[PDB]
């Protein structure tokens, strides 16, 4: 219906999307510095005091437990009651959400260029040091290889043991994390105005020239049809080969990347304050107008429904045929991707430092 169902006031503007966990525990960081763990019916379960503010979203281990970054340096690792399990200092701040391996390994990016693992106890198993500050959250291979970018414009695979294993050079800055594809290829855009499609062993397939930075990642369709956003305000899809299928005009630099419905329609928001639905032809489905810049992806409900956020402050739900559902109006701007639970309540952090669940 698109009613609100309760809503939670932090101290400060909630810019990183809400994390859910197995037991409907909605996980959140705010600009205060604290980790929220709401409970499903808008009541505090616990809220955990960091430095700093909490700019990524917060990830959930196996056994529960909560890690999420802060810019006061640390990674924190929370048990589910609350109280500290550990914390890992790094020199920087964190800018990402950590990423955990197949054994338990925990990895993130600082802003002082190293990439850390720490293992499960809070111990540091190794780091490796990049040029530049590590701006997005490392990818995992199948073999445990991770792959993360920095702002020192390389590509790095590194080892599960730390070593090494090659490192693939683009022409500037990296700021969006590399997506693999299902044959390995590993896909990533680069400030250089490429989409780079690299071999697991370092070598290159192809190089895609897009003429601005790209700065979302890459989203594989399950055709295998490569679609990426440009500061351009182009959306390209691109053939495993390296050929361009079709590329499609926004009127703005594209932020963030696109999402695919099931019916294979390509969703993509724009800084030109509108979200595109394009074809898999790549002709325009339709063009939903918001008031200001797109700054996150879209979310597809179970029912097909769209919702995005807006910078104008309202969350909107779309109909699969364009048509307006609802808006639901928050206090300043939406800068973080709504996430959908488990009953469909529609979670979203907004700057006015609310957390909100709206009903379906």
């Given at each position: 219906?698109?009613?609100?169902?309760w809503?939670?006031?932090?101290?400060?503007?909630?810019?990183?999307?809400?994390?859910?966990?197995?037991?409907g525990?909605?996980?959140?960081?705010?600009?205060?510095?604290?980790?929220?763990?709401?409970?499903?019916d808008?009541?505090?379960?616990?809220?955990?005091?960091?430095?700093?503010?909490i700019?990524?979203?917060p990830?959930?281990?196996?056994?529960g437990?909560?890690?999420?970054?802060?810019?006061?340096?640390?990674?924190?690792?929370?048990?589910?009651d609350?109280t500290?399990?550990?914390?890992?200092?790094?020199?920087?701040?964190?800018e990402?959400?950590?990423?955990?391996?197949?054994?338990?390994?925990?990895?993130?990016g600082?802003?002082?260029?190293?990439?850390?693992?720490?293992?499960?106890?809070?111990?540091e198993?190794?780091?490796?040091?990049?040029?530049?500050?590590?701006?997005?959250?490392?990818?995992?291979?199948?073999?445990?290889?991770i792959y993360?970018?920095?702002?020192d414009?390389?590509?790095?695979?590194?080892?599960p043991?730390?070593?090494e294993?090659?490192?693939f050079?683009?022409?500037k800055?990296?700021?969006?994390?590399?997506v693999?594809?299902?044959?390995?290829?590993?896909?990533?855009?680069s400030?250089?105005?490429?989409?780079?499609?690299?071999?697991?062993?370092?070598?290159?397939?192809?190089?895609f020239?897009?003429?601005?930075?790209?700065?979302?990642?890459?989203?594989?369709?399950?055709?295998?049809?490569?679609?990426?956003?440009?500061?351009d305000?182009?959306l390209?899809?691109?053939?495993?080969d390296?050929?361009?299928?079709?590329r499609?005009?926004?009127?703005?630099?594209?932020?963030?990347?696109?999402?695919?419905?099931?019916?294979?329609?390509?969703?993509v928001?724009?800084?030109?304050?509108?979200?595109?639905?394009?074809?898999?032809d790549?002709?325009?489905?339709?063009?939903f107008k918001?008031?200001?810049?797109?700054?996150?992806?879209?979310?597809?409900?179970?029912?097909?429904?769209?919702?995005v956020?807006?910078n104008?402050?309202?969350?909107?739900?779309?109909?699969?045929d364009?048509?307006?559902?609802?808006?639901?109006?928050?206090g300043k701007?939406?800068?973080?991707?709504?996430?959908?639970g488990?009953?469909g309540?529609?979670?979203?952090?907004?700057?006015?430092?609310?957390?909100?669940?709206?009903?379906?």
């Open positions: 219906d698109g009613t609100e169902k809503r939670f006031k932090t101290g400060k503007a909630i810019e990183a999307s809400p994390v859910i966990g197995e037991d525990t909605i996980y959140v960081g705010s600009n205060d510095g604290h980790l929220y763990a709401i409970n499903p808008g009541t505090e379960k616990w809220r955990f005091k960091t430095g700093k503010a700019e990524a979203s990830v959930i281990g196996e056994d437990t909560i890690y999420v970054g802060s810019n006061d340096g640390h990674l924190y690792a929370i048990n589910p609350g500290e399990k550990w914390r890992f200092k790094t020199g920087k701040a964190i990402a959400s950590p990423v955990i391996g197949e054994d338990g390994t925990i990895y993130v600082s802003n002082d260029g190293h990439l850390y693992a720490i293992n499960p106890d809070g111990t198993k190794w780091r490796f040091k990049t040029g530049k500050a590590i701006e997005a959250s490392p990818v995992i291979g199948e073999d445990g290889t993360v970018g920095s702002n414009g390389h590509l790095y695979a590194i080892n043991d730390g070593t294993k090659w490192r050079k683009t022409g800055a990296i700021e969006a994390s590399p693999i594809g299902e044959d390995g290829t590993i896909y990533v855009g400030n250089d105005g490429h989409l780079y499609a690299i071999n697991p062993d370092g070598t290159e397939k192809w190089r020239k897009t003429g601005k930075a790209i700065e979302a990642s890459p989203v594989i369709g399950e055709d295998g049809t490569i679609y990426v956003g440009s500061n305000g182009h390209y899809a691109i053939n495993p390296g050929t361009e299928k079709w499609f005009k926004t009127g703005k630099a594209i932020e963030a990347s696109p999402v695919i419905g099931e019916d294979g329609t390509i969703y928001g724009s800084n030109d304050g509108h979200l595109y639905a394009i074809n898999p790549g002709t325009e489905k339709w063009r918001t008031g200001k810049a797109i700054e996150a992806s879209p979310v597809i409900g179970e029912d097909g429904t769209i919702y956020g807006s104008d402050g309202h969350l909107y739900a779309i109909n699969p364009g048509t307006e559902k609802w808006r639901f109006k928050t701007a939406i800068e973080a991707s709504p996430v959908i488990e009953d309540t529609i979670y979203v952090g907004s700057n006015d430092g609310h957390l909100y669940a709206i009903n379906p």
